[PDB]
Amino acid sequence: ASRLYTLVLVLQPQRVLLGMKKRGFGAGRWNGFGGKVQEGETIEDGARRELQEESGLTVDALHKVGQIVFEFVGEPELMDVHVFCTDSIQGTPVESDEMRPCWFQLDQIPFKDMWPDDSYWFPLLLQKKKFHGYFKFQGQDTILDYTLREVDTVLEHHHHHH
Ligand SMILES: COc1c(O)cc2oc3cc4c(c(O)c3c(=O)c2c1CC=C(C)C)CCC(C)(C)O4
Ligand SMILES: [Zn+2]
Ligand SMILES: [Zn+2]
Ligand SMILES: [Zn+2]
């Protein structure tokens, strides 16, 4: 029982581009750019689509930095989140109806305004290290338990529908 998602972090030496959910689910929180991988699309096309729709940005390449598994108490279906980062972007960041991109200096990242798991794996991301992580949520604000480990290479899931 799982659903397939992507998350894209736009990362430059001194700054990260985040985006603010403007309405609906998760409104008021800054996040990377991502969403559900659609049927008929590959993981990486979905990551590119999320970034393009939400930030208006195109990228030359995505690095696979991480895999996050979310579990929500009472829900049997896990979220399988493929995490990517990109250094080199093309276009000017512009908001959609869903998301507004904004640059943040790395030491200014607004963790109180982001999802609670970000405080865990963001240090590994900014150190340019790959990771695998798991977070058990109760509601939106509460992590019941977590496992986070640095990895040498991101484990490939061999999704053959995506
Ligand atoms: C990657 O962005 C996140 C994230 O960091 C944490 C998230 O946590 C959630 C917890 C959650 C629920 C959630 O939908 C989330 C998240 O979606 C969530 C997300 C967003 C996931 C992506 C941008 C791929 C619904 C069930 C409930 C019991 C309310 O708990
Ligand atoms: Zn599928
Ligand atoms: Zn990167
Ligand atoms: Zn997967």
Swiss-Prot record:
Reactions performed catalytically: 2-oxo-dATP + H2O = 2-oxo-dAMP + diphosphate + H(+); 2-oxo-ATP + H2O = 2-oxo-AMP + diphosphate + H(+); 8-oxo-dGTP + H2O = 8-oxo-dGMP + diphosphate + H(+); 8-oxo-dATP + H2O = 8-oxo-dAMP + diphosphate + H(+)
Phenotype when changing V151A: Reduces 2-oxo-dATPase and 8-oxo-dGTPase activities and increases thermolability
Gene3D superfamilies, alphabetized: Nucleoside Triphosphate Pyrophosphohydrolase
PROSITE patterns: NUDIX, NUDIX_BOX
Cofactor note: Binds 2 Mg(2+) ion per subunit.
GO MF term set: 2-hydroxy-ATP hydrolase activity; 2-hydroxy-dATP hydrolase activity; 8-oxo-7,8-dihydrodeoxyguanosine triphosphate pyrophosphatase activity; 8-oxo-7,8-dihydroguanosine triphosphate pyrophosphatase activity; ATP diphosphatase activity; dATP diphosphatase activity; hydrolase activity, acting on acid anhydrides, in phosphorus-containing anhydrides; metal ion binding
Activity versus pH, per record: Optimum pH is 7.8-8.2 with 8-oxo-dGTP as substrate, and 8.0-8.5 with 2-oxo-dATP as substrate.
Ligand binding (2-oxo-dATP): T6, N31, F33, G34, G35, K36, W115, P116, D117, D118
Protein name stated in the entry: Oxidized purine nucleoside triphosphate hydrolase
Keyword Nucleus: yes
Limits of the Nudix hydrolase domain: 1-130
Gene name, Swiss-Prot/TrEMBL: NUDT1
Pfam families registered for this protein in UniProt: NUDIX
Tissue specificity of this protein: Widely expressed with highest expression in thymus, testis, embryo and proliferating blood lymphocytes.
GO cellular component: cytoplasm; cytosol; mitochondrial matrix; mitochondrion; nucleus
Family the entry assigns: Belongs to the Nudix hydrolase family.
Biological role: Oxidized purine nucleoside triphosphate hydrolase which is a prominent sanitizer of the oxidized nucleotide pool. Catalyzes the hydrolysis of 2-oxo-dATP (2-hydroxy-dATP) into 2-oxo-dAMP. Also has a significant hydrolase activity toward 2-oxo-ATP, 8-oxo-dGTP and 8-oxo-dATP. Through the hydrolysis of oxidized purine nucleoside triphosphates, prevents their incorporation into DNA and the subsequent transversions A:T to C:G and G:C to T:A. Also catalyzes the hydrolysis of methylated purine nucleoside triphosphate preventing their integration into DNA.
Motif (Nudix box): 35-56
Effect of W115A: Greatly reduces or abolishes 2-oxo-dATPase and 8-oxo-dGTPase activities
